[PDB]
Each structure stands twice: as C-alpha cells, then as structure tokens.
Amino acid sequence: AFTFAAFCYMLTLVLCASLIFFVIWHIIAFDELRTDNIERICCLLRKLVVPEYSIHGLFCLMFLCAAEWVTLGLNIPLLFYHLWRYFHRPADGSEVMYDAVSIMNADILNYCQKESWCKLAFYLLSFFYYLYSMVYTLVS
Amino acid sequence: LESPYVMMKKNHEMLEGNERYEGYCVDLAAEIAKHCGFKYKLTIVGDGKYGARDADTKIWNGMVGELVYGKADIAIAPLTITLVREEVIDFSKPFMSLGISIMIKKPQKSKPGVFSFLDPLAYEIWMCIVFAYIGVSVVLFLVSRFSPNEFGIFNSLWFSLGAFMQQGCDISPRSLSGRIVGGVWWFFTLIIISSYTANLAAFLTVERMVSPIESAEDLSKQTEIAYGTLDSGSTKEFFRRSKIAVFDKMWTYMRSAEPSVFVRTTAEGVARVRKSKGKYAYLLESTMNEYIEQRKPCDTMKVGGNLDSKGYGIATPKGSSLGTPVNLAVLKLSEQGVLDKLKNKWWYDKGECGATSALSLSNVAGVFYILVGGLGLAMLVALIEFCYKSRAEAGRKALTLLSSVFAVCGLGLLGIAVSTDYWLYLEEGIILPQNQSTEVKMSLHSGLWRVCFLAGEERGRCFTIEYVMVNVLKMIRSATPFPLVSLFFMFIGFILSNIGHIRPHRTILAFVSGIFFILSGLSLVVGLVLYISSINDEMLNRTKDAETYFNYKYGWSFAFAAISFLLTESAGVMSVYLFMKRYTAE
Amino acid sequence: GISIMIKKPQKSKPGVFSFLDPLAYEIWMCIVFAYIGVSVVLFLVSRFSPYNEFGIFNSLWFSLGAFMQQGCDISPRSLSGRIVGGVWWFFTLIIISSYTANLAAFLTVERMVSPIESAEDLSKQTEIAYGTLDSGSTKEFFRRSKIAVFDKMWTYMRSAEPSVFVRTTAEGVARVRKSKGKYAYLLESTMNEYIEQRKPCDTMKVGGNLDSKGYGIATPKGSSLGTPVNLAVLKLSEQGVLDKLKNKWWYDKGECGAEKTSALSLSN
Amino acid sequence: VAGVFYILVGGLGLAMLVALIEFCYKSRA
Amino acid sequence: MFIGFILSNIGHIRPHRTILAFVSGIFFILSGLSLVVGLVLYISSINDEMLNRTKDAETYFNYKYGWSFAFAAISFLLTESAGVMSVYLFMKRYTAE
Amino acid sequence: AYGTLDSGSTKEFFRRSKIAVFDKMWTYMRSAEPSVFVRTTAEGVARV
C-alpha cells in the first residue's frame, strides 16, 4: 500500500496546490499591469520567481529517487522549458530573478502572456494527474 | 482410485481400456511395462482398501487380498511396506519415501492498522492527554495574565504543545505562579513519552520472541495449537507404540483432550486446519501433505521434517516371474531420475499454487498521514489569513454571546449526562468452539446512578444502587462526587456570570465566576480519570477466564460529559477575556 | 539422501550503515523527503501573510533542529505557521520512539537466519560456491540429472573455477569451516546430521534431501538368511528400534547440545 | 499512568492558589 | 602535522607572513580529524575480527591496548590544542596588523 | 552439570526410571566425561 512512491505523489500534490495558486496570483497580477503601477507589479512578481523553479527542481529529484521513470519523464521537458528560461536576460541589475531588466517591459507583453496560460495549463493538469496517481498506488 | 496416483480423466466414458486413467502410478506402470515387457491392463481394486487381515475371519481385503487370493499379478499403487503385508506378498524396493508430517495453516500475513502507532498507549490515555493539554494551557493563561503579558491563550497553547513534544520553549514563565504550571506539565510529558517508548519496545520485542512451528519438538511444547491424527490407521498407531521422548509427549497430549482431535477422514481433517485459524496441526503423511499444499486455494502448509520413515512399493503375489524384473526396474528408474520426474510432474508441475526485521511504512503510516494532513490544513489556514488581512484593511458584543451560549450548553450537555444512564456498556458472555460464534449472555447499559440490564438472562428490568445483595457494583461509585462537583462549580459560575452580565458594572463578580468554569473542567478531568481508572482496575481481575470474553464500551452520555469539558474551558477563558476588556475600558 | 551443508551462521559483521537497520530504507527516504516537504511548506506559509525570519535557509534549519529533538532559537509566530511546526513535532516524537524501541528489540532477541534454505535458492546465488566429491555417486547424480534445478547446479560447478570439487569428505568439511560461509558442500544427509552434532559445532544442514536412497543389509544370492533378515528389519523399524538407535548415536552421543548481551562495540 | 494525572491537576490547583495569594498580597501592600 | 609544523615555524621566524600561519593551523586539525578515523577504523577492524571467534567454548581470547596507542591518542589532544592556538595566533596578528 | 553417587540407590533410581523427566536426566549423565559420578558424599559437596 503506502510506499515511498506513494508518499512522493502525496507530497507533490500538496506542493502543486500552491503552484496553481502561484498562477492565479500572477495572472491577475499580469492583467492589472494592463489596466493600470508598473514598478510595484514588477517587483511583486520578482520574489515569486525563484520559488517556482526550485520547487519544480525538487520534483525532478523527487521522482528520480522515487524511481517513477514515467512521472519523471513528464516534467523534465517542463524543466528544460524552465532551465532555458533562466538565462535570457543576464544583464540583470543584481535583482533576484525573471521579468525585471527593462523594467517597463511592455514592448512584447505577449511572451509573458503566453506563459501565464502555459503555467496554468500544466499545473492544473498536474493537480489532477498527481491526484489519480496517488490513488492508483495506494490500492495497488 | 486416489489422487495423484490414479485418477479418472475428464474425457473418460467415451474412453475405454487403460486409457481412462491418468496419474502417477499409471505413468509408473507404463515405465515398468516397457522395462519388464508386459502387455498390462489396469483395473481398480473392487473394495477400495489397501490391505488388512480381518482378525476374525483371517481373510485379507483390498489390493493385498486381490493378489494373495487370486485375481491380480502386480499392484502398482501406494502400498506401504509393512511387516504384516511383507509376510504374504513380495514388495519391490521403495519407489517413494514418506513419513508422518505436520500440516498447519499457511500463516496469512497481516497488514497492520493505519494508526497502529497509537497502540502502546490505550485510547483512554490519548483522550486524556488532549484533555490535559487544554487543561494546562487555560490555567497557564489564567495564572500568568493575572499576575505581572506574553502568555495569552494563543501563546499558552504553543508553550504546552512545545513542552509535550519535547522541543524547546521559545518563551518561559517568569512567575512562581507560572513556573508551577510549567513544572507539572514537564513531569507529565516525561513519564508519558518514557511510557510510550518503553511499551513500544515491549510490543516489538515480544513480537520478535514469537517463533513459528518448524519441528516436532517445537510443536510438542505448546498446548494452544491442537494436534490431530486419523482415528483409524498407522498414523495413530505410530504414537501408541512409540517409545521416543518427543512422541511420548504428543501421544500423552492426544490421549486426553476433548474437543475431539481424532478425525475419521483425510478430507475433514484438512478442513479443521483451514477453518480453525492456525489452531490445529493435523498430522498427515508426507505425500498427501505435499499434495494438498500444491492444490485448491493455498491455505495449508507442511512444516518440519518427517516423524518416521516409510516407503511405498510394487507388489507381486508371492513367487511370480515378474517379481525380480520389477525390483530391478524400480532401482533402474530411481537412478535415471524417472521416479523423481514423475513426482515433480504430478505434485508440482501440475500444481495449483505457484513455485524483514525492521519497521516498514505500514507500521508508522499514520504519522505520515497526520503530517500531510497537517501541511494541507496549514495552507488552508494560510489562505484564510491572506484574505482576512486584506478584509481587515478595508469586541464587547461578540465575546458576550459566545460565553453565555457555551455556558448554558455546558449546563445542558453535562446536566443530561449526569442524570441519563448511558455511560458504559458491559457485554460479558461465553464463546463457542468449531464455529467461533460470539454468544452473548449478559449485556448492560448502566450509568453513574441507576444500573440497567438489557439482555442478561433476558432481564429487561433495570435496577438502582439499593445496597442490593461477574461484575461489582461499587466501581463507578468511587468517581461519583467529581461529576457532581462539576455541576456545583459550573452552576455557581453561571450564577455570578449572569448577574455579572445583567449588572455589567460588577467586574469582580465576572472574573471570579470565570475561575469556576475552569475548576469545573479541572474537577471533570479527575472525574473522567478516576472513572476510567476504576473501570480498568476491575477488568484486570478477569481471573484469566479462558473461553469466556469481556467487553466494555462508552456511550453517548460519556461523550456529552466529555464535550462539556471543552465548553466549560472555552467559556472559561472568554469569561476572563470579558474581564480583560471591561477592566481596560473602565 | 543428498543434502546441503553450510557453516552455521554467526552473529554478524556490522556494516558501515548498520545503525540504519531499525527503520527500513523506505522510511529513511520518507523521512528525508518529508523534511524537505515541511521546510518548503513552512517557507511558503511564512512569506505569505507576514508577521520575516523564516526564509528557505532558516526553514531548513528549524525543521532539522526539530527532527534532532533540539528545537532551535526561532519558532513560528502565526497560526498557519505553528500548525506546520506542531505536526512536525509529533512526527519526530513517534519516529525516534520507533527507532529506539525497535533497536531495543534487536539487541534483546537475537534471531539468526540462513543465507540459503534450499537447492533452488542455491541455484540462483553466485556468491556461495557449491561442492561435492570428485568421484562418487553424489557427483554422478548431478551429471545424469535432467529435471530443473540440478542441471543448473551441475553447469555451474562443471564450469566454476577454482574447481570446487574436493576429493575427500574430510576435505570438503574443512572447506566449509574455512571459507567463512562462501562454500556449501553437498553431502549425504546421514553425514550432515552427524557432523552437525560434533565439536566444533560449526556446520549446519539446510533444506530437504535432494534425492532419495537407502541403506541395506546384504546377503549372498541364495543364502537362508535373506528371508528372516528382511522380516527382522521391518520388525525393528515398526517397533521404533531403528528410530531409537539413530537418536542414541546421532542425537544423544553428540557434543552439540540442542543470550549473553555483548556491549555495543565501536563497529556497530 | 493515573497518578501523573493526579499530580498534574493537583499541581494546577496548587498554582492558582499561589496567584490568589500573590494578587492579594500585591494589591493590598 | 609535519606540513603544519613547516609553515608554523617559518611563520614564526618570519612573523610578517600571516597567511602561512593560519593555513598551517588547518593542518593541525586535519591531522586530528584524520587521526579519529585512524583510531575508529583501527578499533572497528579489531572488533570485526573478534566477532568471528566461531563460538569456541573452553577457549578464550583477550585484547589489550598498549602505550603507543596512548601516545597516538594523546597526540590527538595536542594537535587540536596546538591547532586552535595557532588560529589564536592569527586572531591577534591580523588584529595588530 | 548434574551429579549422583556412583554406588547407591540414587544412581540406580535414574537407571530403572521410566518417567519422562528422569529419562532426560539419565540420558545426560550416561554420556558426559568430565566425570559427574562422585564416589563419596563429602567430595560431591566440594564439587558444588
């Protein structure tokens, strides 16, 4: 019943449930930059960037050690998608992490907008993925 | 006709000749026939017996009697080599060796409970710890926010939950009034955790001191598992004649025990292994024991080396010309491995079953469920704190109504509970062997004052104290005053609360009433402890009463008395929080 | 019958990670990932709706301090934070009471087990090398065997270097007692059960008989002893005499009879 | 473990009487 | 310990070179840290052999450490004590600098 | 180790005995050769 694999699904369920609140927080934060405060929205987005990558970086180490080869295989291309996203603006002025270099980033505003729906896509997919996968493991 | 030796095929009748039969000894027959040079023709013995001399008429029967007295030439069949048969027939050397062996139930491993880590302390302790932790923290709130700050009711719960879990305390009381409450809670949490670790080490040791049956000398010692032999055969007559020390003790046991351990069929004795849940150890012969193991749902198992050494054999009549070539055919087939192949084919390769000294995640599993259930609860509270703080950006009334309702419902729940007799359910009776049904003979649904039977000898009549005239009567009567004092202090505390409420000037009537709400709860803990202590003290004098059973079960008035503890403390602290605001606003 | 002879299993040899035995290796993984699981949740809960002191680096140090029963300088000051610290304090209470109480069950009740308990189990090992005698009916048994397992045991020792076959039974019993539990010699089971009851009391019989054979009282072909001896063996066997004469010489006139609590050495 | 519940509740009630003494002594003097 | 004594003495006869002093100080502790694993793996290996006594009733075994073992263990005390005070030399010289 | 006088009714008790417990005692003392058969009361008290 309860094994090390099944605890890794229970633990990433309770951590992805904050990841989907990380998205609902910033999709309203991105959209209020459109309807208004571009400096204070840019810094409030900054302190929530390094939580997102490193919690997801924990997940890759988690299912690697859990020997869940499939479930590892899912979000490693999301990790590449995340790891490639790290170094794109490397002339940052010592600020923590992404979306603050050109601080009035308004020129594109779609390369950040396609992400906010891409974040909500996989994370809502994950919360129902990891919910069925733990219930699969327990009764097995 | 005996399995696996000679069996009818599924496809017979539409079959005729030698080709109706299958099994071991019809494969062995076709091997000895190829060696000797027969043109053989199987029959089945008319009677259905093996062979015995009818001591009255001196006439044989069965397969021995079919070739002593006529109509058989060879007997390729499980005919055990015995002396009384050897005097009349002519056995080969053994083609199969065997002996008496032990059949027990396959142990059937047990998935431990989810919250089985809560077993070293019985649930009456885990209930009274939670009652103590609220009991200490409200007192530690009282005794520190009265004398000359940082010990509000939120921090005082975190001191006591700090100190119980052995982790350090960030703050510490700086008053002799507070350092007694911290002192007695530190001694409570030292004896409890030393009692959890010690009783858990007594569980895991005594579980490790359990060695299963893997021998005759092991099975000789116990008396909890019943032995068993066929009541007509050489298996019973073995232990009678036996003069070996181990089998002396087994026959001495089975000579005198009267739930009957002497079955009179193989088939029924296999059942009494299966439907008696590891309390029966039927002593079968080692060829039916290894077959029934590799069969229909795999409930039985063979333990231990064989008790004696026997053998099978072919049987030519007395002097036939196929008595020497059959002897040299068995010794040729035994060396080529054909007799070891034909056993593996019928016993195992046509079988129907198949071919860690550490705590695992099944023992401590609830601590991971409480951990995930704890981290899930906290982020649910963290979203509440996030939303409520933004609502705070965009007193006398609320505390008053909550303290009054928790007072009067504290009156209600305890007042019902102190009268209505549904505290304990005693259910002693007897048990029945061979079906394991639980016969009731005495139920009861008594309480604190008036005892009431319910089915004890179908007595539908109640009782009372009456100093009238198995259980005792004066066991609940010990912890009778503390529920009564739980009425006195709570009722006095409600008196000075209401006149403190209808006359809001009188602050000293309010706070002193507040003390009586806690002193009701503190008396109610000793109320519940000395009650539950007295019930456990009586059941320890069960006088060991095997085949009898006892059962106790708390009711709904006990729950109303225990919920009343929650209310009187909660109305207790908020009656003090009334005094916190009124003396401030003064 | 042919049977397996191994050296009697001793107490132990304490490994480098021998202290990790009271809790299974799935628990020590579920401890390490729960510690990182709690530290992340405590970080998240502390940052959102602040009071501060609990970054990710302090939340790893609070939850390590709380696991080692030595609670640190800082404690959460919020209801959402104290639930994380509260249920993690109840986790380490039960786990360390389960480590102590299981380790006290190990050291009290010594229970030694066997590496192999069959020839099927020996067939799949390759760390314990087998052995028979270099010319005899034991060696010839595996040569002509064809069933399932004894073929595999033959093909090993047919091939295996340094030529596990010995040429004297006293040599094979010696190589059991010298090879420290890496050698399992295949004897006839009357010779296992005798040497098992002899000082040094060093070896043991495991498993069941691999084949079946017997001993016999021989006569010339035509002697007048041949018939009454045959009915004497069956008379002695059924009375219990032949079972009694074995117990006298094997299991009574044998030196081997039938808890000291050594202090923990530095090796444990 | 029942006397530990008796020492506890006896220890709590003994500590209230200290604060009952301590407050009475302080407020008067 | 010998390398740590090299940079200590030339740190002492040339008191200007403070970086030779403190780095030598590390080697005095790394001698002692290696000496613990020196003593542990020694005493582990002796206990591992005696566990294979093969139960040997009416026989007896006996082991007993000598005076060189004491001199090796007292050397652990000295290399740590000379270790910290070589750092307390660097505490004063960098201050007085 | 058990022990009986080597000449007397105490030794001859276990020989004739057919009780299961004293069977095991005589089976022991039949075969053990640091000698458990004293030949005086006084010496057997010393070996205690």
Short mmCIF file of C-alpha atoms in Angstrom, two decimals, chain B residues 81-83 86-87 97 117 154-155 158 161-162 164-168 170 193 196-197 200-201 204-205 208-209 241 243-244 308 334-336 340-341 344 355 357-361 364 367-368 370-371 374-375 378-379 381-382 385-386 389, chain C residues 21-24 26-27 30 34 37-38 41 45 49-50 66 69-71 73 75-76 78-80 82-95 97-98 100-102 104-106 108-109 111 144 147 230-231 234-235 238-239:
data_model
loop_
_atom_site.label_atom_id
_atom_site.label_comp_id
_atom_site.label_asym_id
_atom_site.label_seq_id
_atom_site.Cartn_x
_atom_site.Cartn_y
_atom_site.Cartn_z
CA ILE B 81 5.85 -51.54 3.00
CA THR B 82 4.75 -53.04 6.32
CA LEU B 83 5.69 -56.26 8.08
CA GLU B 86 5.52 -58.50 3.65
CA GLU B 87 4.77 -61.94 5.11
CA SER B 97 9.73 -42.43 0.56
CA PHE B 117 1.48 3.52 16.26
CA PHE B 154 -2.73 31.60 21.75
CA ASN B 155 0.83 31.56 23.09
CA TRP B 158 2.08 26.82 21.89
CA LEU B 161 2.39 21.82 22.69
CA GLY B 162 6.03 22.81 22.69
CA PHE B 164 4.77 17.95 25.29
CA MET B 165 6.61 17.20 22.05
CA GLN B 166 9.95 17.58 23.94
CA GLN B 167 11.00 20.50 21.72
CA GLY B 168 12.16 23.63 23.44
CA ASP B 170 10.71 29.96 22.99
CA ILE B 193 6.91 9.60 26.50
CA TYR B 196 5.31 5.19 25.06
CA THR B 197 8.90 4.25 24.18
CA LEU B 200 6.52 0.07 22.24
CA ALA B 201 9.76 -1.77 22.97
CA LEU B 204 8.32 -5.13 19.26
CA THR B 205 10.35 -7.48 21.45
CA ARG B 208 10.15 -10.90 17.87
CA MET B 209 10.07 -13.63 20.56
CA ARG B 241 3.69 -47.96 20.13
CA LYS B 243 8.92 -45.03 22.83
CA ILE B 244 10.73 -41.87 21.71
CA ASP B 308 9.23 -41.54 10.79
CA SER B 334 15.16 -44.42 -9.45
CA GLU B 335 18.71 -43.84 -10.66
CA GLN B 336 17.86 -42.43 -14.08
CA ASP B 340 11.91 -38.07 -9.34
CA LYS B 341 10.46 -36.69 -12.58
CA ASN B 344 7.53 -33.36 -9.80
CA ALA B 355 6.61 -22.46 -7.36
CA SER B 357 13.04 -7.44 10.96
CA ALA B 358 12.60 -3.65 10.59
CA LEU B 359 9.73 -1.20 10.81
CA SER B 360 8.30 -0.58 7.35
CA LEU B 361 5.94 2.12 6.12
CA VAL B 364 4.30 4.15 11.08
CA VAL B 367 2.29 9.85 11.24
CA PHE B 368 2.79 10.48 7.54
CA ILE B 370 -1.13 13.37 10.01
CA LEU B 371 1.90 15.14 8.54
CA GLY B 374 -1.20 18.84 8.81
CA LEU B 375 0.59 20.59 5.96
CA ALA B 378 -1.96 24.90 7.33
CA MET B 379 -2.09 26.25 3.78
CA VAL B 381 -5.42 28.47 7.16
CA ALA B 382 -2.74 30.48 5.34
CA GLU B 385 -5.07 34.71 6.89
CA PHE B 386 -4.21 36.22 3.50
CA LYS B 389 -5.84 40.62 6.45
CA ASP C 21 18.57 -1.14 10.44
CA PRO C 22 15.74 -0.38 12.99
CA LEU C 23 13.86 1.62 10.35
CA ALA C 24 13.52 0.29 6.80
CA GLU C 26 11.78 3.30 2.64
CA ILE C 27 11.25 5.14 5.92
CA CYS C 30 10.27 9.16 3.55
CA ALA C 34 9.22 14.86 4.43
CA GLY C 37 8.42 18.76 2.30
CA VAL C 38 7.87 20.50 5.64
CA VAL C 41 5.59 24.46 3.25
CA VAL C 45 3.38 29.90 4.76
CA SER C 49 0.79 36.98 5.02
CA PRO C 50 3.87 38.02 7.02
CA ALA C 66 13.05 19.89 15.33
CA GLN C 69 14.95 16.71 19.24
CA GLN C 70 16.78 20.01 19.82
CA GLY C 71 14.38 22.88 18.87
CA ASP C 73 16.27 29.72 18.53
CA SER C 75 9.76 29.41 16.43
CA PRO C 76 6.79 30.43 14.23
CA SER C 78 1.47 32.68 13.44
CA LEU C 79 -1.39 30.16 13.49
CA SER C 80 -0.70 28.98 9.95
CA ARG C 82 2.55 26.78 14.09
CA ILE C 83 0.44 24.02 12.51
CA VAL C 84 3.47 23.15 10.36
CA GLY C 85 5.74 23.13 13.39
CA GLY C 86 3.14 21.37 15.50
CA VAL C 87 2.55 18.30 13.33
CA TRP C 88 6.26 18.01 12.60
CA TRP C 89 6.94 17.90 16.33
CA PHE C 90 4.56 14.95 16.62
CA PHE C 91 6.27 13.22 13.71
CA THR C 92 9.72 13.18 15.29
CA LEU C 93 8.28 12.08 18.62
CA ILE C 94 6.91 8.87 17.10
CA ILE C 95 9.79 8.17 14.70
CA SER C 97 10.41 6.46 19.76
CA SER C 98 10.14 3.87 16.98
CA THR C 100 14.73 3.33 19.98
CA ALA C 101 12.03 0.75 20.62
CA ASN C 102 12.92 -1.26 17.54
CA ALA C 104 15.92 -2.46 21.78
CA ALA C 105 14.03 -5.33 20.18
CA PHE C 106 17.03 -6.21 18.01
CA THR C 108 17.31 -8.27 23.17
CA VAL C 109 16.16 -11.03 20.82
CA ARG C 111 17.45 -14.16 15.71
CA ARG C 144 22.79 -37.54 -15.22
CA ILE C 147 14.83 -32.13 -14.12
CA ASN C 230 14.21 -58.92 5.70
CA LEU C 231 11.35 -59.54 8.12
CA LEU C 234 10.63 -54.44 9.11
CA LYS C 235 10.03 -55.72 12.63
CA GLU C 238 7.89 -50.63 13.22
CA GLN C 239 8.63 -51.09 16.92
#
